Design a binder for this molecule. Sequence first.
Ligand SMILES: [Mg+2]
Ligand SMILES: [Zn+2]
Lengths: 60, 117, 74, 110
Amino acid sequence: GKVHGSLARAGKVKSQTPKVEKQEKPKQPKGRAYKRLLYTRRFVNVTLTNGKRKMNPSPS
Amino acid sequence: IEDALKVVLRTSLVHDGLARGLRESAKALTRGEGQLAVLVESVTEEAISKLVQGLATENVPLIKVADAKQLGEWAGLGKIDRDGNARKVVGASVVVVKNWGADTQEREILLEHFSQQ
Amino acid sequence: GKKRKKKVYTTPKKIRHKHKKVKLAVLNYYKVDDEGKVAKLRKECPNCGPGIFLANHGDRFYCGKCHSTFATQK
Amino acid sequence: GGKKGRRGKNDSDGPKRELIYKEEGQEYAQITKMLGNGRVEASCFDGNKRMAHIRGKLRKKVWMGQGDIILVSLRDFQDDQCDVVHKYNLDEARTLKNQGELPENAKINE
Ligand SMILES: [Mg+2]
Ligand SMILES: [Zn+2]
C-alpha cells in the first residue's frame, strides 16, 4: 500500500538492504609503492589526455 | 556395401523418401510406396521385425543392417550442426526408402545383388 | 489513469489436452500369420486408399484422414 | 480552482482505489480537533488520544478536516505521538464500519 510496514522504524533501510560480500581483492601495495603506482598511473601513463585527467572515469 | 546405403539415404532424405519410423513404414509398405527397407535385429521382443518381414511378404527387398542408434545416426535423423554428433541419442530402428531419387551404379549393382540373394 | 486489480477467476482450471501416446501402438493394428502372411486387425478406409485403419469406438467405424466425412455404423 | 492546478502532478486516481488495511502498528483513528503547525489530534480506536503529525506525501497533497477517518502509524519508542499516513475519503470508511475493524460506537455520517 502507501507504506509497506510501520513507518520510521529506527534503521529501516539498513535492515532491509541486501548484504553483499566483499570481493577477493588482491593485495594493494602500500607505502612508497602506492606513491610510485600513483606517479606511474598519472604522469608517465597518461591515459585520457582529452579533457581533464578524469581519474576514475565512469564507464558509459 | 556401406557406401550405397548412405547414398540411398541421402537420395531419399533430399526428396523425402525415408519413412522414418515404423507406422509410416508400415503404411508405405501396405501402399505401393516402400521401395527399400533397412531394419535392425537388435530389437527387444523382436515382434516389430517380424511384422516388418510379414508386411514385406505382401516392394520386396529388405536389408539387415544392425546398430539401430548408428542406423539413425547415418540415416540423417540428426540435425548434425557441428562436425561431431551434437545429439545425445537418436535412432530409427526401421527405415523405408520410397523415392529412389538420384541413381549411382554401385548402389544399383548392390540392390540387384541383394534382390538375387 | 487506470486502476486495475489482480484478476480473480471463478473457475478451477482448464488443462491442455495431452495427446494419448501409445507405446508399441503400430503392432496392435496388425497380426502376423506365423512367419509369412499378415492380416490387419482394424478395417481399411476406402476414401483414402489402402493402409489407413478405421477407428472403432461403439457401433460405428471412423476414419482419421478424411475423418469428418466417414463415420459408418457397424 | 486556480492556475495552481496545471503545475501539479495531474495524478488522477478518480476511479475507486483499493482501500488499505492496518498492518502491525498502523491503526485506524478519527480526527478530533485541528491544531496548528500541520499537526492533528487523532482519537485512536483503543481509548487513547494520540497526537498525529500531518506527514510527508500528505501535507499539501490532500486536505483533511475535523471528523475524518484516518490511518496512522505509531512509534514504538514514543507511543504518545504518531504520523498520519493515509486518508480514506468517506466511502471505504463505510465499508470498514460494516466490517467493524473500529468500534461502531464512533458513528460519523453526513
Ligand atoms: Mg500537465
Ligand atoms: Zn478416410
